[model samples]
Target chain A: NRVVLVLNSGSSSLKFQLVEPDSGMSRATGNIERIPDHDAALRRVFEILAEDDIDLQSCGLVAVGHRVVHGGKDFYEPTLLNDAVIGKLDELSPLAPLHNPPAVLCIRVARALLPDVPHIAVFDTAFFHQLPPAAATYAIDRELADVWKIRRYGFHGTSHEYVSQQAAEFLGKPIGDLNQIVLHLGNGASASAVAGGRPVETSMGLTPLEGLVMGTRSGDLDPGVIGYLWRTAKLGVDEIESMLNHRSGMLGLAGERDFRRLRAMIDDGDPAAELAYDVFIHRLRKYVGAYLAVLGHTDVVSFTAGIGEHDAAVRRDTLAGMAELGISLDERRNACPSGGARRISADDSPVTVLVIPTNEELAIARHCCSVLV
Target chain B: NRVVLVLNSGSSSLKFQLVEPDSGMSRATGNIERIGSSVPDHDAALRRVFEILAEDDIGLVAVGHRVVHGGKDFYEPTLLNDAVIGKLDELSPLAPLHNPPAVLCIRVARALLPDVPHIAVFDTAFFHQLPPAAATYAIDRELADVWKIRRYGFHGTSHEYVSQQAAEFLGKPIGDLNQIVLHLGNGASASAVAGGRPVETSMGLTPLEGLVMGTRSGDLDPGVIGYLWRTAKLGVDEIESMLNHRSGMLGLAGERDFRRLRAMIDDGDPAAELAYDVFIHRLRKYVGAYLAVLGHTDVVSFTAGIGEHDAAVRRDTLAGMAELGISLDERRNACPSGGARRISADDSPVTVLVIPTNEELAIARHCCSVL
Candidate 1:
């Protein structure tokens, strides 16, 4: 069995990439948008992939792997998708409220489409289960800590797990020996302090919208600010939560969601663009400083995800003049357009700062290949 | 005015100390228990103090000085006792919800002692007007700053007026002053980092609580702890507020207030008392830690009030092991006898910590002296 179909489904969108892990060649990759229904998106992907690649029929599709976010504490390791696992994920639906329903829909579609094939789930929290007790424990009563299971179950597991491995390969060393910080700078950007291969601490807490500004969420507002807004600003908790989730960060500071357009507008001297960019980068620097303090000595910090890998200006700004942190970008080398695993650290720099492009599909394909064996 | 009738009122308690400030002598100092009229604790002290000091007829013409716990931005340098200032204290009632009324009661009883001169009204928030931008800014809209109001207020004229004089009396020059912290361990204990003579901070959001432990109230609960206690534990915010406000260091920890109970149990070996003693000490240590961080230098700190002044157990537990900054005279110190106003510091320590708190009375007298 050489072919694996990996599905990453989000509300209103589903992205699929089919590949032969042996050849590491993608059969096809595309997203079905306007997916007012996620199940329909999954169905369209299966139908299209089958029609477009005859190799999908002959290659003996071993399994369908799903990128299921928020595994909670139960699925610390990858598990074969079953009714029990699906039910458990349903219990955790309140956690990733926006994303779970779509993920469930995709699961239903996948089960229907690949009736005879084994399906596995790869969790976004699986990579962060190794967080140290100090890093993991919130300064709360342990009785409640036990009863609620409320703690940091970091997302971006697939990207972080993938990029760090790529970083290890790029550095010509084993992943186990490197203390790396990988910023998965996407629509939902998160920074993880990876000591050795496992994440020790990450920025997102409880239900995300924590630590460092993101595309449209306020990061790191004081706990008092919430109640103050409720009492004084007369904002209901739900309204405030929506503001933090949807209407803050880049969109709050600026008006756009697209980073490329944001960059162009910033270059065009748009004040909103400039303000939004400054807020985002300021948040990045704040978290970077904190993580550095947390990690004690960071060896190699990698910038992954779409904006992190492709945006030259952000890459420069994040690594620029942060010499005290031992991070400096190879500006001339970084500005050069390139692909695959890459490093942007200068020869004189103390920490190796790299721009490692994320290959989540490839990582999912690799995970699917290893399992079902 | 030879006799100073210092009127100190709590939300539920009233303490009036009759002192001859010039001679540094107290004719008689007594407190009234529980002030709510329905509870009638407010009338207890007024009856008793008047009865005890009935013979001091020279002061029977009452020169009553009231302590207004917060003056907001009024910072009005110990104003005279008048109808307008009395209304101002009533207006800012939320600043110290419990203290104002017993103060107002001094005038209510004026028809009985009709000829008494109600002299001074002091504010605790006066000296804390000097918080720098860092401690003062709440990170909200800058309008709050434009209004010159934020946190870093409350219990000032006490912590402030006490620590500065403590420094001078200790013969530590106030000029080259780097770091100093003052713990007025009373019903309201405050900690300060004096860079010069200005207070960087004392407590927060409200002076409800912010230390390792206090007689009542505290800080940074899990945000849900309040509501959980309300909805889940069948507790109301009022009970939670009371528990935090009237009940932590003394009430919950099973000690008399840290003043008497600190010694009554310590060297006597009570776990609950020792726990409370340790807790309050730990809170002061955290203040010390903050001072070291904020001052970026070693600081001289003092502990005053009930626990700081009267309890040798509190002083030993709080200041004894602090070799990093201070050393104390266990013999001259273990002299936990009340109101001697002695130094418990040893020479050449990085931090000279002692217990000489005179804020409330000083505020009262300053108010009376001026009024």
Candidate 2:
């Protein structure tokens, strides 16, 4: 069986997995973490693979997939990595300063180590490339937006794309005939409204810094809040950016970022934890309502990612009192510890509610094989 | 009738009205425009107004002020004195472009009418009791509280007045209704009312956050501000001014008047159409948000200039919201010269009405009660 290797790089670490293309099963997986830089991390990954006797040259790999975070309106499909593409990724680094540069460095080292295999770049924004103009455009100066490329380019494309397909499959309906709202809730969260398998609108904007509150990111803040911070605190651009990006959201409200630990803290009657949970649930409920309005009539609402798959209370609270919109969740089914994509809505409800565990690495692997073909 | 002279002083102009508080009647109204200067100019406008009042032989028993920003302090319609005036002056930086001038106007007007009962009615006091969950921003709460940076919704007197009218129109007690109030004027705002009080509002921190207005960018991504800081030569002050003054419908469609925008749309201009779309789109989102905030909305009242007159906007905004149990009656919405009437379909789950706003009456009533 020919395998495809998927490498997902973040600012601090790298996650790599080898997948069998046809069966969609992982052959091997490993993570290289807490290193100084990308080059050292990649070197250590190879050494670890060799020590474990997972020889890359004898692995029957068809292609390598690199998860490049930002494609910046240029790439909407899995792209073949060449020198020019690598150079382009470097140029787009500033858009995702903490994400893309590491992936670019990993691509260079991966190509050198696996010279005979094809390498493909999968973008987190590709699924939202065709968002409707009205939904995509921010209400600002058009000339400035056009000149600087300031518009909503949503992220979590792979997960949103994957979950919507899963929802359609679970419902046994044609994907082209379904409209879905996908909530990819993780350390970084986003919501997307997919009409007939194409994204119409998403919560994230020009940068990953928009949309649903994440582990350390404030989402959907009043733009004037920044002005207030500047005027009142004398904090400049860099300081404001740092606070919003690093010192906000769950961490800013409570002392914890992990949902599991936050839930535990809430059980212990920690007001900060309880407040953070309420804020998170409030933001979620608003987006659910907003996206429902965007879709007019929706078929399915699916939740994925770490928190989305495991957090039952979040799902219940978000869909609570929204029965007027044809959503009624099955409490027992929601709380039941289940795996894979399963419907949690009542059987007679007009709209389907689902919990789908996302597999971005597998999605990347499939896309890589398709590009190679 | 004993009267209160209502004085509303903005950055550029001062409007004065002799209102009969008991009857909610405005005996007369006039505005002084383009004074171009600050306190001394307000002093001059007052002299002109006082002369006009003197000529009409109307003696004022009380003076009511429409102070824009009360911050967190002046919750109820406050009785102003030397100390209250000083406190209002300290709260100036929060509304640098608005509050300072109003304070200065209050100083001059108070000096001129030293013997009358001058009461200050806060535009923000109506929303002073927003539930903490709705009021708190998901940021550093300590920093936010220390900086006095939390949601302080505007358009209070208008929202409170329209909501009360809607309650009375529906023949329900005001305290028994959960309503969504849309104050769509040159400066638009939407508020979620649960039992006669604001639970959540579109505007946050400054009036700059909320529904799309004539010349203000509303509900923008915070990331946009960071992008502008990195890309443009404009500093924070310039950016703030541009957002507040040169943006919104005027900045987008090259027209600020709603009627002109509608006409331009009829003439098939894309920018004008886009502007209208953005405005209507923002309105829809806020409506959706407020609907969620008020779980089960019993009534939705539209007021102010656009809400009262722009029938097309009212229809379009409520078009596809039927699934949420809201349906607009086309004939009622199109019926001209109907001051305040129900506009929702007969079987609609939610009651939707159009009520023309009377902010001056509300201000007068507040001051009347105080004096």
Candidate 3:
């Protein structure tokens, strides 16, 4: 009868799921979209939950799990929310302005609505907190970096952690004994190199905007681009920041934000869409190769989330010429989806390739239950 | 005997070299440093170069001018005229501190040697063959196009000259070999060439994009700029100058000279050792990335200052890369060779060489071909 409620708040939307942490099953789930205001949209969430006969005030909810964006070298595990915790989350908002503020908003609303329920804050950066020094530090001014708390704070922790664990499970191996490269290819994509269940290296840095090409994020740009734009285009810091976060990647290249739609357009010989797809794949291959060098050897390379789960062409093309790295994709197995976690590499390949669908909600719920115990 | 005079003007200095194009022999070379407070420092340097050459009886038949930031206009050496000078001036803003002085030097050269033809050889023209996929950033194409921003790699003369020499030394046609060129100098850059054409390179839009250098930070996270602007209150000019002139090995280790840095490391300075490791770390990443870009590399060539001289750097860079089909001959790498020499074992799957860079000779050759 113990059910955990997981809340994921974004810049414009709220997602909630009531999951059983033990079996990884969700009993109820819903979300509120097009939310221009956090307070009103949050109220609407409780109203809908009441209509579903789950009144937070009276219902025996075990705990509410809130997914926070940045952990910032602190809060490496599921943290019980309190006044100090909320204050720290507020301080972390500048690092994840589009994410942490809204997450805090939802946390406040839920705490008010269900005063007695234990609320826990889960961090997207918690999984990468163990990143080695060489992998985490940027070569910059040491004093400035320390003063600003500048380091590689990778995002999508729940997704990457879930997929890496599940990959080990599906491979019938111990997580502690395997090295994996888990690529979370969603609206905002990232690649993490996991050795012995710890992240050795990841693609993103400081913010979620520095990794693989995504719906709207331009990943791995030359720092000179910002300086050049300011000099030549006469654009200010705010305009350049917005352009980088909004008007880039697939949206900038093809004017489409979704990978499925871009693929459909590419199938029809749309030049812009083809270029967008090619650029994405090119970056993916390079990151995969880089992580391969970082770990020296990988047991399995798994793909998850939107493009990683559904886009067969991307997975095939990314691993096309990577046989030298012991990664060879099975064409037939790659194209056909079996609706479950499975391997998609040649039998003789030294490294196993897998497609693991990510479930961040359940992962958060599990963390919530563990912290309570 | 016809000797082509090549002038390389910078924001604070100028270098001139008189060389025979066919034989790749330099008759004379010198430079004027710490320029400024002088009216048109480029003109003064050119005047001195002319006087010195005249004294040596080295009559220049043609002048080869090194112009940076050619934009997207020229694919080969262009004959310098009034219109070309105007075009080069228009592109100066792209390389604000580099191109303007070179254009000014050209005017002085043309006036002093009116009878001799002056050819403008661009650092960007060598990378004109880069495919769109290799050139385009994952940003708004419109903004990139409107700003004329893309991957315009620098150090073209050195890369082109070394690649040509490596191809000849290997007894293979330039059209059949693929090479990964690492120009690790005070200002380092890398290039990937496929069958005599540049397919990919590390430098982008400006010269401050790829490979760690003596004083320039290469391949930084774009978010760091926004963060610094907001938190550190750093202006655009300050940030650009710091990245271009204050960062890199100098900023990290407190030494700009590679030879001194190595000595400090040998003397057990942790900071110097860290700086050397960071430099090697960055270079290793680019080498791995370019290898992916080329898919299959035939020859991995090293040139320029550090790449030509630092055997330890080469040994460390190629360490553990054997799995990627690159095998370095440790004995040859550490033997301290003087000129172009192969450092890969006979049975190694990939070839590696250290070739001395001769950008002046390259400019002279291009001038010979064009004029």
- Give TM-scores of chain A for all candidates: 0.94, 0.97, 0.97
| Tens-digit per-residue lDDT, B1-371, candidate 2 | 87788888887788988888777778988888887644347778888786776787664677888888889988788888898888888888788777877788888898987889889998888888987776777777667778887788899999899989999998999999999999999899999888897888888788988788888888666777777777654588877777887778887887889998888999999989888887887788778777776778899889988898999999888888888879998898899775779999999999999999988888888886876
Clashing pairs counted in every model = 6, 0, 0
Model 3 lDDT tens row, A146-171: 78888888888889999999999999
Q: What are the fnat scores of the candidates, in the order listed?
A: 0.00, 0.46, 0.42
Candidate 3 chain B least-lDDT 10 residues: B37-46
Docking quality class, candidate 3: medium
* Top-scoring candidate (DockQ): 2
The C-alpha local distance difference test score for the whole of candidate 2 amounts to 0.84
Separate DockQ for every predicted complex: 0.07, 0.59, 0.54
Off by over 4 Å in 3: A57-60, B37-40, B50-58
Please report the TM-score between candidate 3 and the true structure. 0.95
- Residue A279 CA error for candidate 3 (Å)? 1.7
Candidate 2 residue pairs in backbone clash? none
The local lDDT score (0 to 100) that residue B129 gets in candidate 2 is: 95
Candidate 1 residues lying further than 4 Å off, grouped into runs, are: A22-24, A54-57, A257-278, A312-322, A337-340, B1-371
